[PDB]
Every structure is written in structure tokens, then in C-alpha cells.
Amino acid sequence: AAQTNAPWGLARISSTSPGTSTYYYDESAGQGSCVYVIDTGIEASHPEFEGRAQMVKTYYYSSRDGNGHGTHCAGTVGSRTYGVAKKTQLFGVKVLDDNGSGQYSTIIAGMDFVASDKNNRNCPKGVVASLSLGGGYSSSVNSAAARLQSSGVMVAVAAGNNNADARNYSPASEPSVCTVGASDRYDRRSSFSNYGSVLDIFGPGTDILSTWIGGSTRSISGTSMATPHVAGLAAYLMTLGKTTAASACRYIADTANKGDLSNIPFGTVNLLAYNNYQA
């Protein structure tokens, strides 16, 4: 399948070169997979989600996304126009308040929630969790992310936006999950992207168009935006049967575009997520 005039990041993940604008992908499109977006919520009523999104948990007075961040990330995973995996099922877990903040105890509870809640959902092709959040190093936060991964969920986490070594941030620094840095449309490391040996992969993160609250759209930047590209890619590849939740991060690294990014610090992987789709 081909989506013309796609957001640059979608085109990038199906291309061996920057500078194109059509996204190519197998029509299975993540059908039969599920992606949890652990964030500020999801505006599931947005036409872009087509009834495939739902809120399943909140720790606050509402499950609604009063911020937009979670809706944007969910759109990059799986919206019809802005999403990588256009037929996946999206499940929202609101661990962040409408200011975008959350306590680590709540975030940990949300991760353990997903590890159990997947047993209440129909995801025959597999389960992914996208975590566009983080703060300073916490062994308890890292352990929660490790549990979620161990339970059979492909965990993708943002590297962080400090232009610093991600070893000092959580859950970015957890070795067993997939830690995602950000790149721009010219294949440069995004100016704010964290780096370091704990990164597994880069995805598009600068000037990413996706869904927003109020049935709208906007373009924003962050490792928060790169992470759902990788989460959606994992769901897509799991639906194709090419990999599993336990092996998808390694598979994405195996099949990535290699050595094509600029300003990658020595010791950080130079790997850009790529779907290897041959139309």
C-alpha cells in the first residue's frame, strides 16, 4: 500500500533515503495487534482513530486527554492518516495529568496494569506499549518497565529531550526495553535528543504532524514523537509475523537503516527504524 503526501516520518520509516513523501506498507497494517499508549490519555472520539482507540485506565478524575500529548503519540502509532500501524487497536492508560506530569508511583502502577490488562484484550498478533515519558534515574521505574517487557509486551520508551546521556533517565536507561532517540527530516540527530549506549534505535522526532485534542492536528517535536513510530513499527512487524514482543527491538535494530544519521556521538548506535517493505 502507498499513502501519498504522508508526514515525513512515515515516509522515512519506509525508505532507504530521506527526502520522500510517500509511506509504503503492507496492507495488513497492524491488524490483530494492540498498542497501549501510556501517557496523558487519548481523545478516542477523534475521527482519525476510526473507533479503534479506547481509554482503558486512568489514575485521575477523567480518562480524557486534556493535554494533547497522548493523543498525538497515539496518532503516530495508529491513526488513519498520521499512523504507522493504521489498523492496530489502541488502548489508553492515563498516568500523566493534563499538565503532562505524573508521579513515578502512578507510572509504575500503569506499567503493571498493562502487563495484566493485556490478558483482558484480544491481541492475537501481539502487544506493544509506548512510553513517551520519563524523568531522572529510578531503579523502581526501570524494574517496572522490565517487568512489562518480560510479561510479553514490546516496550518502547523515549530516550529523553536533554541532549544528554540517557543512562541518567528512566525508563530510558532500562536495558531490556527499546530506548528510542529522535532524528529530523535531513537525517540529523534531533537537537534535543538524548544519546548514549542505552539507546537501541532512532525514529523521526522533529516536526511530526499527528492528531491533537479537539479533533485537530499539529506538528510538534520530541523523543516522545519518535517512540510511537517505533511502537507502531513493532505492531506492524508483529502482525506480519516477522518478530515477537520479546525480539522486536532487536529485529528493528537488525533491519534498520545503518550509518545514515549525522551528529551521532561516538558510542551511540547509528540506526534508523525502517520497515523494509518491498512493494
Curated annotation (Swiss-Prot):
Q: Which residues act catalytically here?
A: 39, 69, 224
The residues covered by the Peptidase S8 domain are 7-279
Keywords assigned: Calcium, Disulfide bond, Hydrolase, Metal-binding, Protease, Serine protease, Signal, Zymogen
Q: Transmembrane stretches, by residue range?
A: none
Q: Which residues bind Ca(2+) 1?
A: 175, 177, 200
GO BP term, pick one: proteolysis
Q: How does the cofactor attach, per the note?
A: Binds 2 calcium ions per subunit.
Q: Which residues does the annotation say bind Ca(2+) 2?
A: 16, 260
What are its E.C. numbers?
Answer: 3.4.21.64
Q: Which cofactor does it need?
A: Ca(2+)
Q: Which GO terms describe its cellular component?
A: extracellular region
Catalysis: reaction(s): Hydrolysis of keratin, and of other proteins with subtilisin-like specificity. Hydrolyzes peptide amides
Protein's UniProt keywords contain Cell membrane = no
Under Gene Ontology molecular function, one entry of this record is:
serine-type endopeptidase activity
Cystine residue pairs: 34-123, 178-249
* Organism domain of life: Eukaryota
Query: What is the annotated role of this protein in its UniProt record?
Result: Hydrolyzes keratin at aromatic and hydrophobic residues.
What family does this chain come from, according to its entry? Answer: Belongs to the peptidase S8 family.
What is the protein name given in its UniProt record? Proteinase K
Organism, scientific name: Parengyodontium album (Tritirachium album)
